[PDB]
């Protein structure tokens, strides 16, 4: 429809109406497929992700870290923004949870998932980069934070960049998007003391070699 792949895979509120395909031969976007990332930032290795998803033999979505039970020590309800409005309400990406301090603290976070069901699993997450130290105190409490993510083939420590940036969609900060494929039999872990947006949903899949993407208003 009117969404591009980043919008669709992250869960832009306006892509909620799209159905989920179990398989597909190619991807079709219109020249007007403007609904992508709604909270401005760098979508990393976007082109490689688009290629991997271009032709899929099997695809299913599953909740990975249940919204209500995975983070009893963090606030999963205040993580909304005017940058991703839904029917006038502040909202956020459907496949992600933006965790913020509960009360007046942000206890160290440690979570994992084991992919013991047999398909490759695509996990996406993001990192928040506040414009000011005043936001860091409002959202994460901890002034000096880090984020770490890993799997048998992935390891990266991230650090937030607090800076005033030009406003984009009225935001003075940015949120970056990262992703990786967890092989069957492997484990993915997350650790943070702040600034981490955690996956809520993840996808299981099998790639059908690869095709292509058509940008067109020609009807299906």
């Amino acid at each position, epitope marked *: 429809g009117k969404c591009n792949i980043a919008g669709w895979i992250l869960g832009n509120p306006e892509c909620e109406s799209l*159905s989920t395909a*179990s398989s597909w031969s190619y991807i079709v976007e219109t020249p007007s497929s403007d609904n992508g990332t709604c909270y401005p930032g760098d979508f990393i290795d976007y082109e490689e992700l688009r290629e991997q998803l271009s032709s899929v033999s099997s695809f299913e979505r599953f909740e990975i870290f249940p919204k209500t039970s995975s983070w009893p020590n963090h606030d999963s309800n205040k993580g909304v923004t005017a940058a991703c409005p839904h029917a006038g309400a502040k909202s956020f990406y459907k496949n992600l949870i933006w965790l913020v301090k509960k009360g007046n603290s942000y206890p160290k976070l440690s979570k994992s998932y084991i992919n013991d*069901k047999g398909k490759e699993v695509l996990v996406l997450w993001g990192i928040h980069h506040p414009s000011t130290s005043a936001d860091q105190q409002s959202l994460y409490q901890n002034a000096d934070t880090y984020v770490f993510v890993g799997s048998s083939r992935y390891s990266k420590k991230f650090k937030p960049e607090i800076a005033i940036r030009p406003k984009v969609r009225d935001q003075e900060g940015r949120m970056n998007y990262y992703w990786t494929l967890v092989e069957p039999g492997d484990k993915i872990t997350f650790e943070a003391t702040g600034n981490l947006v955690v996956p809520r949903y993840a996808f*299981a899949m099998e790639r059908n070699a690869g095709s292509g993407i058509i940008i067109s208003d020609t009807p299906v």
Partner: antibody
Amino acid sequence: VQLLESGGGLVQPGGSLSLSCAASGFTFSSFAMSWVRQAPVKGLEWVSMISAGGGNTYYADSVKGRFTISRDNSKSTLYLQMSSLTAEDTAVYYCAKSDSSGFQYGRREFWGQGTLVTVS
Amino acid sequence: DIQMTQSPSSLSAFVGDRVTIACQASQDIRIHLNWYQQKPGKAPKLLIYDASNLEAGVPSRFSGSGSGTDFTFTISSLQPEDIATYYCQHYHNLPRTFGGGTKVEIK
């Protein structure tokens, strides 16, 4: 969320009874759905399941070849066609949300409160 | 098919006593379990998922553990609110199968 079963009642053996389940509070079209059977003797049995897009189904061997499972996402509704009914199919039937779209990954988190189907 | 065996089928204890049940798989199912609580007149409520992850809204009394073919469930110190039939369920493969149900009475 809510899942509300509809249809049920007392019928004679043979013939059929149609059940349906109305979904609310969630994007129905994003999830796979299933039916569970609660017999008075066998505590919990299972009947059938359908993928989120309706592309695939899976049936208990005990109902396979008789029952038909289908859905219409535009109406947020799940259907079960309980054809060729017998006395052994008397049970309370429940509809449930699997919290996945493809059967293989998932959790049957939310069940409706069910309906009673009696065959005699 | 993988059939769960649940034991005891009936359990009773007084309030404050420690209550545990056990359930076994006929095949190694890793940790693919869902424990349910069925209060009379209600659809069963999921209490524990992926064998040991306590579900939201379920009090700390409840806990699960185990792997492979032998799993357990505890409700710690038993309270009157816990009268229910508890059920095993696993989702290792298809069909998903249930255990027989353990009736827990309090007195």
